[PDB]
Amino acid sequence: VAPVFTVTKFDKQGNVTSFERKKTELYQELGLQARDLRFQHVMSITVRNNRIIMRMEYLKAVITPECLLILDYRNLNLEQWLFRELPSQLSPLPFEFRAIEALLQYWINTLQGKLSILQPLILETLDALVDPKHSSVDRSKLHILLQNGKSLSELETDIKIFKESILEILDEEELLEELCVSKWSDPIDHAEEMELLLENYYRLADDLSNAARELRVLIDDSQSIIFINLDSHRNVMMRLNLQLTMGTFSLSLFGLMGVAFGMNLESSLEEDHRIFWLITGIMFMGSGLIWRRLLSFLGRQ
Amino acid sequence: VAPVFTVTKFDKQGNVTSFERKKTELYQELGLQARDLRFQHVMSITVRNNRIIMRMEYLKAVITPECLLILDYRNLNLEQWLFRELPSQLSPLPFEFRAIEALLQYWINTLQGKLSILQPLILETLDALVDPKHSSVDRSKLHILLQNGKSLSELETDIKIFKESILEILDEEELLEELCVSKWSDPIDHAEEMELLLENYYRLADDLSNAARELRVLIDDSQSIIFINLDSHRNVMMRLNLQLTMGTFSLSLFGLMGVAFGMNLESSLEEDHRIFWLITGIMFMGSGLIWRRLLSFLGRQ
Amino acid sequence: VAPVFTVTKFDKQGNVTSFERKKTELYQELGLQARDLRFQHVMSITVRNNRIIMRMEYLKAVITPECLLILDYRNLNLEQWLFRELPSQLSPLPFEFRAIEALLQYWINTLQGKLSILQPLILETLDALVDPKHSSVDRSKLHILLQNGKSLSELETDIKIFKESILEILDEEELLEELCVSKWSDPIDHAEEMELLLENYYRLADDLSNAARELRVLIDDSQSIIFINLDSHRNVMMRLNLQLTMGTFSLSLFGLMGVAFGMNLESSLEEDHRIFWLITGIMFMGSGLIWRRLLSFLGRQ
Amino acid sequence: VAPVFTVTKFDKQGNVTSFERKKTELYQELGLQARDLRFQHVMSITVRNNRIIMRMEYLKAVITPECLLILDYRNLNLEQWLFRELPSQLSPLPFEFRAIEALLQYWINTLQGKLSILQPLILETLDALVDPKHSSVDRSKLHILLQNGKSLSELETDIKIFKESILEILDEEELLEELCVSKWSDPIDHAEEMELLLENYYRLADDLSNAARELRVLIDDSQSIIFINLDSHRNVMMRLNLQLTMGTFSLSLFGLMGVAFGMNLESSLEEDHRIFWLITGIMFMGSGLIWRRLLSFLGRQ
Amino acid sequence: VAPVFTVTKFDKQGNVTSFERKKTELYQELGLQARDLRFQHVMSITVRNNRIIMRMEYLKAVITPECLLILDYRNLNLEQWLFRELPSQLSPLPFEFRAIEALLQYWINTLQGKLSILQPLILETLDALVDPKHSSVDRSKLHILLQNGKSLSELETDIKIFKESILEILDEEELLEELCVSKWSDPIDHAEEMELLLENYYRLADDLSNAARELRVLIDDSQSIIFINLDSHRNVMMRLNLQLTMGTFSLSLFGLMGVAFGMNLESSLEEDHRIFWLITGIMFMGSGLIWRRLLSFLGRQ
Ligand SMILES: [Ca+2]
Ligand SMILES: [Ca+2]
Ligand SMILES: [Ca+2]
Ligand SMILES: [Ca+2]
Ligand SMILES: [Ca+2]
Ligand SMILES: [Ca+2]
Ligand SMILES: [Ca+2]
């Protein structure tokens, strides 16, 4: 079966149609070739034979001075935007400006929604983890944070790609003049409007990137604080265990003294009880004295 | 209800007025459009139809060759600066230079105050934490440090945005000539003065950024030193606990020897006390000898 | 023995030949010198006397307006690509475009295969390690991850070299015109096609580099999470050991009390059993009371 | 009281004078304004009305085609350099070259002295800390290292500022021609000499920055090595404590066996001593056998 | 004593001479001044009065259209290269190309030898350390690794300096034309050959820098893996010690029960042996039951 594109076409007035067209017929209808409608890059903006070709992560659009086309829209939840919002936006400037503005606004809104969803989850997770009232932390939250950080890195990469793609065009005036496809097809400055649009969208992308960077540095700082808190708790626990070990060692020393003195033989002291009381008191007090001296030795350190 | 701007207007002589004006009426009065007075960016400097538009984090100003306007000043604690200082500053160069200088000076002073407030708190907290006389540290101070670091990152982002916005204009002479709105409206070099102003403010922002970077690297170094101190304390505590365990093990070994020799049976040695004294001395001395040998074994490591 | 190149030659029609030729004879046949056919760089693209010289990590190609040559193809598993695919690709544009496209596509496919092989192994290893259900992790997996990370770094370096080499040419139009060797040899725009090819391959390389960077940051985050999990497990284990030590210390204290009271002498209390029961109950209950108080003391911390 | 500058003036022949002059009188004497002699930047180099203005961290100089002036030299330990060295340096090229060379050489020598003082202290401290023969390290040395690192960061910032300030001028020829104040005041190439001077000083600053970067990376590596050594010592100590605990557990198990067999009741075995000897030997040997088996179990791990 | 240079002179034919010449006489013989032959930079390439001046870390060369001079060659192990190899290299292009190629090749070979010596030592040390079969690692190897890393950082700095110095010249055509000293002294393109030489050497330096960067990242990854392995071993050791402590606590609890029941008083149970056997079995079994329950409690965590 020959390959076919699932195309949806928008007119200047906002009329909407949808069908499936073979690639060869689509090439013949336009002045393009299969070399162009390949979509080998994640993000791309290009001009060929007075036809604009734009592609995003999952969006593919072709702009013509009299119509717009979107390709491969199936199973992408684009129906609400396609059949409810885009016609309203497209309904004195040429069609190209409106189409470009609509597509860029859609992409920017998608990125903004992604960031707004990501931010509160990470903030809440970090606030919960940083709680210094617990000597341990959960791990499902750690896994969630790892996944959200991976998503944040992907979002940052996408934003950087968007910024680079826009900047590559904003630098050269040749591409800016090329985008004025209507002027060339059928010969107030278009260049100023295009520059304003691109600058606005680039600034928005820059703001999003700055926010993402702030979030990442916050994550790193939270990780460091968590490490410090865990280390402090470890040190406190070891101090307590050490002190108890000191007391136990002294107590066991005196207990050995007592039991060894309690040999199951003849010592010639079995006829005196005052001696037994004296040795009992001796062990009981000496344990405390040695314990206090050893605590002082620990303290001097 | 139609949207309205809460506007305050300053004249050349310093006269001050304040009112509320609908957006459509404001557009009609000027030569601008709703496309411009949108304020979609955190920071922006632009020129349209010989009218300057400037925006900061929460400040919105429009400069006209004969007047200045500030929008959305309510609930922002700007009354003292608006009605007490700005008229004095505005009271031979055109109005645009004075207005731009006043606004830039206000922003720079705000950033300087933020940095001056942030610095001593972080310095004191780090000095308190680095104290090597304690095996543990507080956690409320850690939370305060985390919050202050987040604020520092935000301040650095704002400073970078300011620097980039100023540099984007300082590079091109077209925008510099555009800023001379009075010359174009009603046709000594203005460009030199504008360049001097922008360079001065850019240098101040660079100094602030350098200070913030120094603070951040200091924070990182303090964190590393804290980690090292905690590790050293842990090692010392483990050494002490180990030594006490060695002594306890030897002592318990000899105590087992004694108790096992003290079986509740007939051994045929119950008629000798010298033997009991000999075994008591044997355990008492051998404990010390084994303890010393084991300490030597630990030391050789 | 004079040095010789193992050369394989492809014609415009796709005809294939292979032989061995001495370096001096090869230089004489062409208009080049030994200074050029040295291959001292890992990656290189150059033009000399209307002859293109290209080199990769292990590939060496010379492009002539009427033929293509590949050098040192032995023991490199290139037979399948050389004798099965390249002739089909070479079978209206000149030969140079086809040859360059084929070689660049080969290199890009090799890099893509490398990355696709590397990704799943690292992902699976990290998923296995991050499992928070174990207090310890394997080490053979760690060694495998280290080796794969080294390979990833090498791949990133190669991708960066490719991007830099392509960009160095894309910037200057002189080299672009030079690549049109057929036009100069025997005097629609070639420059546009060359620019399109180079831009496409550069964008593909950029995508690969972005993917590698994402993988590296994921590795770092996984390492940090592993550290945190290990620290938490350590803290929990120390808490348990501490509590058991507290109980043991109290129990041993009361046991010492009992044994010391059980001296092998005359105390004048051997005629009372109620006293023995009372002391037994006293130790048994006091152990629990002291243990509970000490647990409360631990909890307050 | 009107503000006054403490000025010291150097003539072409090297004559030296010093006095205090009001700012208004100083402005009137020159062709400058208060806008210029403000000194709002840490480092600055500028030209105004054929007068050079230079400022460093604490140095302020004004160069005139016939004289040099230094401002605010009090309480700065500049007397030795001012009244002993500068006249000798100033005693065929114009005065501006000599003055600029002297000031730049002074600043470079100051930075070199700072770096030479900082280096040996850090090197010695790191060498002392890295000593792997100790399980713990001092903390006063850590504080000293932290302070020295802060100073190093400040020095790096100053060097970077110097480099940027020089480069900003070296790029544009307009400023280079402006620095030839004598030529403009009273109309062999001056530009070549200025370029040589600036390039030399920039290269020296670059060398200093490289040295500082090397020192910083050395510090980081030393920190990592310290962490590794502490971790290894911790592991060794825990191994020893574990082994001793294993032995103690076995010994206490057999001691419990013995004491429990030594109940203070009637067992019907009190008439046999061979049994007592057998049980004593049994415990004594079984302790060792269990200890060896448990050590083997530890080793297999 | 007046300063003197230890000079060695090479002629076009390869003739070699060596002597000592005073600086003033050397300046008079050439068209240079003491300002040039100062050698204040670690690396430098410059042209003055149709004379080339080049300096490396410890090499100082002056190129003249008819001769070459090397200064301060004593105590530097340069005899083998000076009197055995350089004449062969110098024996249709002018002398300058040969001299520059020889010097650059010497420097590149030195750097390559340094890197080739450094690599295997670091690789072997890291392979030995990463061995996960040991719970501890040596420290002399750590010191060796630290020293080798310092040397690697120095080598990277030198390579970067070389690259920057070459690039500074490759950018501007004025310096390229200046290097053609023979053409200017006594008026096929020299510029092409110079560009080829500089590009080749720059690419070689870039390859060396990439290799060094790969080595550094490998070192960092190895450090992280070492940390992880040590942490895992610590956790395993703590688990074992914890389990043994649990068993010991239960055993000591039951031993206390037994000894306390064995009071040296009258209990009225001394006439029953079945009771003694029952209590012995009770303690012996209950120890195991409690131990198993506590192990289950540990496992559930
Ligand atoms: Ca992606
Ligand atoms: Ca640690
Ligand atoms: Ca903000
Ligand atoms: Ca490689
Ligand atoms: Ca007894
Ligand atoms: Ca400073
Ligand atoms: Ca060096």
> B152 is written with which tokens?
């520092």
> Cβ–Cβ contacts within 10 Å for residue A207, how many?
18
Nearest alpha carbon to residue C279 among A281, E258, E263 = E263
Kindly determine whether residue C251 and residue E256, on different chains, have CB atoms separated by under 8 Å. Answer: yes
Tell me the C-alpha to C-alpha distance, in Å, between residue C75 and each of C6, C8, C59, C72, C154. 11, 14, 12, 9, 22
- How far apart CA E217 and CA E227 sit, in angstroms, is 16
E58/E103 Cα distance (integer angstroms): 12
Contacts 24+ apart (CB under 8 A), A206-212: A206/A163, A207/B41, A207/B42, A208/A111, A208/A112, A208/A115, A208/A159, A209/A156, A209/A159, A209/A160, A209/A163, A210/B157, A210/B161, A211/A115, A211/A119, A212/A115, A212/A152, A212/A155, A212/A156, A212/A159
Residue type, D58: Y
Nearest-angstrom CA–CA distance, C283 and C269: 18
Residue whose C-alpha is closest to residue D133's, from B228, B294, B301 = B301
d(Cα A193, Cα A168) in Å, to the nearest integer? Answer: 17
What sign results for the dihedral spanned by CA atoms A278, A281, A284, A289? Answer: negative
Which residues are within 8 A (CB) of A82 and not within 5 positions of it... i.e. 6 or more apart? A8, A16, A70, A73
CA distances from A25 to A5, A37, B262 (A): 10, 13, 106
C-beta of residue B140 within 8 angstroms of C-beta of residue B236: no
What's the number of CA atoms in the CB half-sphere (13 Å) around residue A260?
26
Q: Please, what sign has the CA dihedral across residues E211, E213, E214, E215? A: positive
How far apart are the CA of D212 and the centre of ligand 7, in A?
11
Distance from CA of D25 to the nearest CA of E (A): 41
What does residue A59 show for φ and ψ, rounded to 5 degrees?
-120, 140
Length of chain D: 301
At E266, which helix (H) or strand (E)? Answer: none
Which long-range contacts does A8-12 make (Cβ < 8 Å, 24+ apart)?
A: A8/A69, A8/A70, A8/A73, A8/A82, A9/A67, A9/A68, A9/A69, A10/A67, A10/A68, A10/A69, A10/A70, A10/A86, A10/A87, A10/A90, A11/A66, A11/A67, A12/A66, A12/A67, A12/A90, A12/A95
Six token digits for residue C254: 């009361």
Of C41, C58, C78, the residue that ends a domain is C78
Contact E276 D268 (CB under 8 A): no
Q: Are strands D4-11 and D67-71 parallel, antiparallel or unpaired?
A: antiparallel
- H runs (alpha helix) in C42-189: 79-80, 86-90, 95-130, 140-171, 173-179, 181-185
Dihedral pair phi/psi, residue C93, rounded to 5°: -75, 160
Q: Do C263 and A252 touch (CB under 8 A)?
A: no
The rounded radius of gyration (Å) of the Cα atoms in chain D is 38
Other CB atoms closer than 10 Å to residue B95's CB: what's the count? Answer: 19
Which tokens hold the place of B224?
A: 């590393």
DSSP assigned state of D52: E
Question: Does some domain include residue A152?
Answer: no
Beta-carbon contacts of residue A20 (< 8 Å; ≥ 6 apart): A4, A5, A6, A7
Secondary structure in 3-state letters for chain B: CCCEEEEEEEECCCCEEEEEEEHHHHHHHCCCCCCCCCCCCCCEEEEECCEEEEECCCCEEEEECCEEEEECCCCCCCHHHHHHHHHHHHCCCCHHHHHHHHHHHHHHHHHHHHHHHHHHHHHHHHHHHHCCCCCCCCCHHHHHHHHHHHHHHHHHHHHHHHHHHHHHHHHCHHHHHHHCHHHHHCCCCHHHHHHHHHHHHHHHHHHHHHHHHHHHHHHHHHHHHHHHHHHHHHHHHHHHHHHHHHHHHHHHHHHHHHHHHCCCCCCCCCCCCHHHHHHHHHHHHHHHHHHHHHHHHHHHC
What lies within 8 Å, CB to CB, of D85 at 6+ separation is none
Q: How does DSSP classify residue C85? A: I
**Residue C98: CB partners within 8 Å, gap ≥ 6?**
C89, C90
User: Comparing C-alpha atoms, which of A78, C78, C252 is closest to residue B252?
Assistant: C252
Number of domains chain B contains = 2
Q: What residues of B are in contact with residue D270 (Cβ under 8 Å)?
A: 264-266
DSSP secondary structure letter of residue A81: I
C157 is in an annotated binding site: yes
Residue finishing a domain among A60, A79, A98? A79
Q: A79 vs A55, A84, B160, C45, E66, CA distance in Å?
A: 18, 8, 41, 48, 80
Do D243 and D295 touch, CB atoms closer than 8 A? Answer: yes
> Cβ distance C260 to A258 under 8 Å?
yes
Note whether residue C31 is domain-resident. yes
Q: What resolution (Å)?
A: 3.1
Tokens at D38, concatenated:
């403000």
Owning domain of residue B25: 1-78
Last residue of a domain, one of B61, B78, B95: B78
Q: Residue B172: name the closest of B195, B188, B193 by CA.
A: B195
Tokens linked to E268: 């009225």
At C247, the amino acid letter reads G
**Is B293 a member of any domain?**
yes
Q: How far is CA D40 from CA B100, B198, B207, D8, in A?
A: 18, 14, 11, 21
Q: Token digits for E215?
A: 């080595």
Helix orientation angle between A274-300 and A190-261, rounded to the nearest 10 degrees: 160
Structure tokens at B39: 């304020």
Asked, for residue B263, whether it belongs to a domain, the answer is yes
Residue at E271 is within a domain: yes
CB D18 within 8 A of CB D9: yes
User: Residue D261 and residue E147: Cα distance in Å, rounded?
Assistant: 63
Query: In 3D, which of D280, D266, D163, D147 has the Cα closest to residue D210?
Result: D163
C-contacting residues of A 42-61, CB under 8 Å?
42, 44
Give A-chain residues touching B241 at CB under 8 angstroms. Answer: 238, 241-242, 245
DSSP label of C21: E
Distance (Å, whole) CA B229 – CA B243 = 21
CATH number of the domain that D58 lies in? 2.40.128.330
Q: Which residue has the tokens 């100089």?
A: D61
Q: After which residues are there C–N gaps above 2.5 Å in chain E?
A: 91, 187
CA dist., res. C122 & res. C223, Å (int): 12
In a 3-state reduction of DSSP, which class is residue C55? strand
| Contact: C200, A40; criterion CB under 8 Å | yes
D131 is in an annotated binding site: no
Minimal CA–CA distance to D26: which of D41, D5, D8, D2?
D5
Give CB contacts under 8 A, 24+ apart, made by E156-161: E156/E209, E156/E212, E156/E213, E156/E216, E157/D210, E157/D213, E157/D214, E158/E43, E158/E57, E158/E111, E159/E111, E159/E205, E159/E208, E159/E209, E159/E212, E160/E209, E161/D210, E161/E42, E161/E43
Task: Measure the CA–CA gap between E246 and E249, rounded to whole angstroms.
Answer: 5
State both tokens at D16: 């030296």
Tell me which method was used to determine the 3D structure.
cryo-EM
Compute and round to an integer the Cα radius of gyration of chain E. 38
The contacts of residue E123 (CB under 8 Å, 6+ apart) are: none
Q: How far apart (Å, rounded) are the C-alpha atoms in residues C161 and C56?
A: 10
The CA-based angle A16-A20-A26, given to 5 degrees, is: 95
Asked whether residue E45 is assigned to any structural domain, the reply reads: yes
Residue at token pair 């703590």: E238
Least Cα distance to C26 among C43, C3, C60 occurs for: C3
Chain E residues 185-244 within an 8 A CB cutoff of chain D: 223, 226-227, 230-231, 233-234, 236-238, 240-241, 244
Tell me which chain C residues have a C-beta less than 8 angstroms from the C-beta of E234: 234
Size of interface B-D (CB pairs under 8 A): 131
Q: Tally the C-alpha atoms within 13 A of residue A157's C-alpha that lie toward its C-beta.
A: 21
Nearest-angstrom CA–CA distance, C47 and C181: 9
Residues C149/C126, Cβ–Cβ less than 8 Å: no
* Residue environment code for D43-53, b if the CB has 16+ CB neighbours within 10 A, otherwise e: bbbbbbebbbb
Question: Rounded distance, CA A255 to CA C95, Å?
Answer: 98
Of A189, A129, A201, which is closest to residue A165 (Cα–Cα)?
Answer: A201
- A90 close to A106: Cβ distance less than 8 angstroms: no
Spacing, Cα C119 to ligand 1 middle (Å): 14
Q: Which residue has the tokens 């491969």?
A: A72
CA distance D99 to D63: 8
The CA–CA distances, whole Å, from B90 to A16, B83, B100, D216 equal: 57, 12, 10, 49
How far is residue D234's CA from residue A196's CA, in Å, rounded to a whole number?
A: 62
Which residues of chain E does D204 touch, with a Cβ-Cβ cutoff of 8 Å? 40-41
Instruction: Indicate the burial class of A87 (C-beta count within 10 angstroms; 0-12, 13-18, 19 or more).
Output: middle
Q: Taking each helix axis from N to C terminus, what angle separates D190-261 and D95-130, rounded to the nearest 10 degrees?
A: 10
Maximal C-alpha separation, chain D = 130
* Residue A54: CB atoms within 10 Å: 20
Widest distance between CA atoms in chain C: 130
**CB-CB contact of E204 with C203 (8 Å):** no
Q: Which two tokens stand for residue B135?
A: 């095996």
Return the sign of the alpha-carbon dihedral for residues C23, C24, C25, C31: positive
Q: Could you tell me where the beta strands, DSSP code E, fall in A67-108?
A: 67-71
Amino acid, res. B96: E
E236: Cβ contacts below 8 Å, ≥ 6 apart: C135, C136, D301
DSSP state at residue C172: -
The reply to whether E190 falls in a domain is no
| Distance of alpha carbon B140 from alpha carbon A110, whole angstroms | 38
Q: Could you tell me the distance, in angstroms and rounded to a whole number, from the CA of residue D150 to the centre of ligand 7?
A: 23
- Residue C18 located in a structural domain: yes
Sign of CA dihedral C178, C179, C184, C188: negative
For residue E69, the tally of other CB atoms under 10 A from its CB is: 19
CB atoms within 10 A of CB E107: 19
CA distances from D172 to B174, B214, D137, D294 (A): 19, 30, 53, 79
d(CA C244, CA C286): 17
Report CA-CA distances (Å) from E145 to B45, D22, D126, D227, E222. 53, 62, 15, 15, 12
Residue indicated by tokens 């060097």 = D159
CB contact under 8 A, A270 and C265: yes
Q: Indicate the residue of D227, D236, D249 with minimum beta-carbon distance to E136.
A: D236
Helices (H), chain E: 23-29, 79-80, 86-90, 95-130, 140-171, 173-179, 181-185, 190-261, 274-300
How many residues make up chain C in this entry?
301
Residues E166-175: contacts with CB within 8 Å, 24+ apart? E166/E45, E166/E198, E166/E201, E166/E202, E166/E205, E167/E202, E169/E45, E169/E198, E170/E195, E170/E198, E170/E199, E170/E202, E175/E47
Per-position DSSP letters for C236-298, written without gaps between them: HHHHHHHHHHHHHHHHHHHHHHHHHHT-SS--S-TT-SHHHHHHHHHHHHHHHHHHHHHHHHH
Question: What spatial distance separates the first Cα and last Cα of chain E, rounded to whole Å?
Answer: 84
